[PDB]
């Protein structure tokens, strides 16, 4: 019931603007890049001209001993690859003037908030994430950041709606920030470093936990499905597959045609740079390509509830994911068929957002027959030492967001420069 955002930076009518009543002025550098499909996604390189300056009206400049405030934004931080990034804190969003104010900085495996008063008393809160982890929720993936400040007690950093760190700030006196917010990599020794950022907001209160969860939901709610990294899922784009129940396995094929089958096998194997990262390999297994069937949209974005076909790439040729639903048993084993020879086999897939918390990249694929009847969500089943891919209505009968729907939840991983792995072939 009360307008609390004092800066709401959004792309509208061909420009990045402040949608708040204050209409703060935006100065964009010549080397800022916007994502072609989602122009709210902004890429800042390690270059002087890759910067955005927001000029705040005097009335909303922070100059206070007592006023509470918060900031929120989404960020996508490429994996750290090189030892030059160790012990190298670099500013990314700066509202410091004359050694007072606030800033967001990054370091190897860290997002850091710093406040500083006009007597050089500082406090930091820090989110630390590991690069020695099989599959990370955070590395090179869109994550939601929220930072809140209550002058009588704590500053708090939340990640994806969850409190990560809080520290006292009650001893800080007057904080007098800048009338400019500078979005720019400052002090970064890795010449190849960049970030992606979106939906920057400032608020004139300490947001509460409910408000933050609502913001997280509202800014991630979409009728558009997303890939593993959090970008829009697309038609006609090759993806490697991740199953959420068995994330250390990958999809392979045991022969094409109706007597062959798709299956999961593992482990993935590792990608590494000593002392810098150790992760599971993501570019493994047969690539899938999502093909238009029913959608009347002319763009190539995959939307929630779109009915599609799934192609499987085998030896640089596309096959159709399909099954004969008449086979005995609820689990219908999936095959990779020659496209011209699919005939009346079941092949139409409803792409469904799991509608879990956060980004709409947890995908379910409901296979339907040619009369539109459900054959079931695509998952896997042990026969009995091989984990074959199946469509099964058993999944459709399970409790939502429970253990028994992990097996039919998938993510789609395209090659991305922020991950840096080299495919084996
Ligand atoms: C065989 C089996 O265990 N499940 C298969 C099921 O078999 C039936 C009975 O199993 C259920 C059921 O009725 O569906 C499973 C339900 O979840 C239970 N409900 C609840 C609320 O818990 C239900 C109850 O326990 C019933 O009241 C029990 O009757 O049971 C199964 O117990 C029963 O087995 C008989 C047995 O045949 C007899 O010999 C014996 O005398 O008595 C027992 C008990 O009666 O058989 C029932 C019919 O055969 O049948 C369905 C089809 O209807 C499925 O095949 C089901 O297997 C599941 O298949 C789906 C795909 O359809 C997936 O492949 C599941 O795999 C995963 C998954 O969850 O995705 C993969 C995971 O890797 C695996 N995890 C681990 C750690 O290994 C999980 C795991 O089983 C759990 O789901 C953990 O989340 O499974 C696959 O399990
Ligand atoms: Mg939601």
Author numbering: 873 to 1297
Tell me what the authors wrote about this structure, in their words.
BoNT is a protease which is produced by Clostridium botulinum as a 150 kDa protein which must be proteolytically cleaved to become active. In each, the C-terminal part of the heavy chain, the binding domain, interacts with specific gangliosides and protein receptors located on the presynaptic nerve terminals leading to endocytosis of the neurotoxin. The BoNT/A binding domain has two sub domains that each consist mainly of β–sheets. The N-terminal half has an all β-sheet, jelly roll barrel fold, while the C-terminal half has a β-trefoil fold.
We have solved the crystal structure of the binding domain of BoNT/A in complex with the polysaccharide moiety of the ganglioside GT1b, the first step in cell recognition. The GT1b analog used here differs from GT1b only in the replacement of the ceramide (the lipid), that would be buried inside the membrane, for a 2-(trimethylsilyl)ethyl group. Six of the seven monosaccharides in the GT1b analog are clearly defined by the electron density, while Sia7 is disordered. In total, eight BoNT residues make hydrogen bonds to the GT1b polysaccharide, five of the hydrogen bonds are to Gal4 and GalNAc3 that also have the lowest B values of the GT1b monosaccharides. Trp 1266 is conserved among the BoNT serotypes, and on BoNT/A is located in a binding groove that makes extensive interactions with GT1b. Gal4 and GalNAc3 interact with Trp 1266 through hydrophobic stacking. Additionally, the indole nitrogen of Trp 1266 hydrogen bonds with the carboxylic acid group of Sia6 (3.1 Å); further underlining the importance of Trp 1266 in ganglioside binding. Glu 1203 hydrogen bonds to both Gal4 (2.7 Å) and GalNAc3 (2.6 Å) and the carbonyl oxygen of Phe 1252 coordinate Gal4 (2.6 Å). The GT1b complex crystals grew at pH 5.5 which is comparable to the pH inside the endosome; this indicates that the neurotoxin ganglioside complex could be stable also inside the endosome. The GT1b analog complex reported here represents the toxin bound to the presynaptic membrane before the translocation process is initiated.
